Amino acid sequence: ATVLSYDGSMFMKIQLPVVMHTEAEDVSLRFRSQRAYGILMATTSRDSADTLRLELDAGRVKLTVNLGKGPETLFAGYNLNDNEWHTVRVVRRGKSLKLTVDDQQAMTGQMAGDHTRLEFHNIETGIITERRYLSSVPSNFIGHLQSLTFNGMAYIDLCKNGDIDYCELNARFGF
């Protein structure tokens, strides 16, 4: 429903009150953009390089997961910067990953190493603001997001309605 718009200088961050270590994530997000490159969503930790990161890369969705052994990647979809709405879904259960764009093929991967837990303090959109161990800085997002759900939490609406205490943002709500 509720759309959040980003002009390249805008962000929305969920800055969680205590560190999280998750064994599994289910993330879904609708987006629309003209840009071939740009952050969609990333988890960040103040204390490590761990991440579950989605971005546009050459018009594809690129998923990067780093649980402690280093970044591994998976791509799905193409020509997505057509300024039409697209959906992306990620499901991680320990070492197992699935990435699907527009309810097309589920792209699968298996993580290397013994790590199953993702450390994060923040869920970031628009701009990655916690950058210290940030492996590389994605371009800031220029476009629109809708229906961000992260482990059952519809953060655009939760933030819009002040239903949680954790949001920081300067992106623009609309429809």
Can you give the binding site for Ca ion, defined by CB under 5 A? 50, 67-68, 115, 117, 119
Please identify, using beta-carbon distances, which residue of 68 and 71 lies nearer to Ca ion. 68
Minimum Å distance from CB 66 to Ca ion?
Answer: 8
Nearest to 49 by CA among 2, 114, 104, 118: 118
Minimum Å distance from CB 59 to Ca ion?
Answer: 30
92 is in an annotated binding site: no
Any bridge partners for residue 98, and if so which? 91, 108
Number of Cβ within 10 Å of residue 165's Cβ equals 7
Name the pairing type of β-strands 38-44 and 51-57: antiparallel
Minimum Å distance from CB 55 to Ca ion?
Answer: 20
Q: Whose CB is nearest to Ca ion?
A: 68
Q: Count how many residues are written for the chain.
A: 175
d(C-alpha 11, C-alpha 87), whole Å: 19
46 is in an annotated binding site: no
Please identify, using beta-carbon distances, which residue of 59 and 68 lies nearer to Ca ion. 68
**Which residues are documented as binding site for Ca(2+)?**
50, 67, 117
